């Protein structure tokens, strides 16, 4: 029959979970955001649409940090995004408290992964309306990760999600090809600003605000930090220049 899309834990006859699929819709509809894994860290950037001149500039920050070494950015239902990060924070804290060592990016990934997958198991809950790009540096290098409402996630060299997800994925792939030896944290910040500016064409209607953050072993001592001031403008420029 039909109606296999009214409850969250139901399998359609072809083996799907429409509710989860409908969630992905809420995501694709959201702003665009990316992650670039450089050779000793990860860079995060996001598209911040300026709905009006009323929004205090530089104020409604999107990228979130978990603990001190992990960075999170997501596209879709922001509130769901935060909800997830809160859980990640508790999740990371619980971990450190028992094992002392700050939670390894991979372990954290599956920590968020199992939680999210958990919301595709019961009809009493709604799946997450967000895709999340997150990562950081740990005992063995840097890691970039993307998590889907389905709970699925994998390690990426580059990742993008949202409205301009394709333009991005397009650009990210170009990078991967023209840099087999790796990209530097400094360079990834620039390239990210560009890739965000390009992906902004599928929303060229409203003006936006760029927001980059990175976690580099050599640049930030393995700590997640927001790219501000000079280095920021410098990237905004490197992008503004190549958009013409």
């Amino acid at each position: 029959g039909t109606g296999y899309d009214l409850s969250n834990s139901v399998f359609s006859p072809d083996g799907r979970n429409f509710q989860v699929e409908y969630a992905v819709k809420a995501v694709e509809n959201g702003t665009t955001s990316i992650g670039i894994k450089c050779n000793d860290g990860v860079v995060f950037a996001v598209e911040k649409l300026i709905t009006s001149k009323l929004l205090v500039p530089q104020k409604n920050v999107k990228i979130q940090v978990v603990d001190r070494h992990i960075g999170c950015v997501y596209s879709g239902l922001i509130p769901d995004g935060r909800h997830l990060v809160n859980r990640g924070r508790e999740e990371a804290a619980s971990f450190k408290k028992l094992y002392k060592t700050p939670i390894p990016i991979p372990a954290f990934a599956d920590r968020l992964g199992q939680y999210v997958q958990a919301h595709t198991l019961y009809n009493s809950v709604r799946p997450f309306g967000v895709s999340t790009i997150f990562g950081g540096v740990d005992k063995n290098g840097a890691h970039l990760y993307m998590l889907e409402p389905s709970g699925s996630y994998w390690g990426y060299k580059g990742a993008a999600t949202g409205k301009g997800r394709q333009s991005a994925k397009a650009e990210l792939e170009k990078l991967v090809d023209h840099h087999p030896e790796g990209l530097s944290a400094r360079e990834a910040v620039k390239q990210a600003a560009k890739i965000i500016y390009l992906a902004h064409e599928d929303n060229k209607e409203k003006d936006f605000e760029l927001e980059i953050s990175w976690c580099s072993l050599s640049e930030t001592n393995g700590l997640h930090k927001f790219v501000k001031g000079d280095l920021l403008q410098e990237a905004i420029d490197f992008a503004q220049k190549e958009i013409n």
Binding site: V61, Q64, V65, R68, R89, A93, K97
Partner: protein
């Protein structure tokens, strides 16, 4: 209801014209056995607050984690974590104070005496004490345990009343503290020769001195002392 096991002794501190000074030896006693010698009992929270802890070490370690966590937590969704919305000593104290009184009220105290020393954002010096009962108080000088008896009378001679603080320099203050540390070495059977000293100056910031030692001790007269009354040789 517990009973301390591995412990730390006196924690002394006073305040001068520009900031505050705080020190504590690096010992971890276990009864009369001076068991551990590399114990740092001065925890810096940020760079405008140093927390001195005496009492049960295991609980001290626990409070350390709480403090570091409080730092991580503050950074969350806080673009001004290292500015207007960074941790103030007063916040760190209130938190600790809160925790301390809650534990005693639950009949499971954190067997410690603590002194939070630092400089508020508006330049003000901050120095307050709190112990396993939750009792709190401030004075131009503060010391825990043995320092409450020997260190205070010395430091109080430098800053007896409020109006004395602006008249005290870091040199004077640091000296007073260094000396007290020595006196404590002479009469506290649970003290160590090595200690750490921290200075939080509203101008120079936090200077954390480690591996200091009590020097210039007077012992020579000991030779002239024989017997315990009538013995002549």
């Amino acid at each position: 209801t517990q009973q301390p096991i591995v412990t730390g002794t006196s924690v002394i501190s006073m305040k001068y014209d520009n900031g505050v000074i705080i020190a504590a030896d690096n010992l971890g006693s276990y009864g009369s056995l001076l068991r551990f010698n590399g114990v740092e009992r001065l925890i810096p929270v940020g760079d405008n607050t140093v927390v001195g802890i005496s009492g049960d070490i295991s609980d001290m370690q626990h409070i350390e984690r709480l403090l570091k966590d409080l730092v991580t937590e503050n950074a969350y969704d806080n673009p001004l974590a290292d500015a207007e919305e960074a941790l103030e000593p007063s916040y760190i104290f209130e938190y600790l104070a809160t925790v301390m009184y809650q534990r005693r009220s639950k009949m499971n105290p954190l067997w410690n005496a603590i002194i939070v020393a630092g400089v508020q954002s508006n330049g003000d010096q901050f120095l307050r004490y709190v112990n396993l009962l939750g009792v709190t108080y401030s004075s131009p000088t503060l010391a825990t345990g043995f320092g409450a008896h020997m260190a205070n009378p010395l430091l109080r001679k430098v800053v007896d009343r409020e109006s004395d603080i602006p008249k005290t320099t870091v040199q004077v203050a640091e000296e007073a503290i260094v000396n007290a540390m020595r006196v404590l070495y002479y009469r506290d059977a649970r003290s160590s020769r090595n200690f750490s000293l921290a200075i939080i100056d509203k101008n120079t910031g936090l200077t954390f001195k480690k591996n200091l030692q009590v020097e210039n001790m007077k012992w020579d007269f000991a030779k002239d002392i024989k017997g315990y009354g009538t013995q002549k040789i």
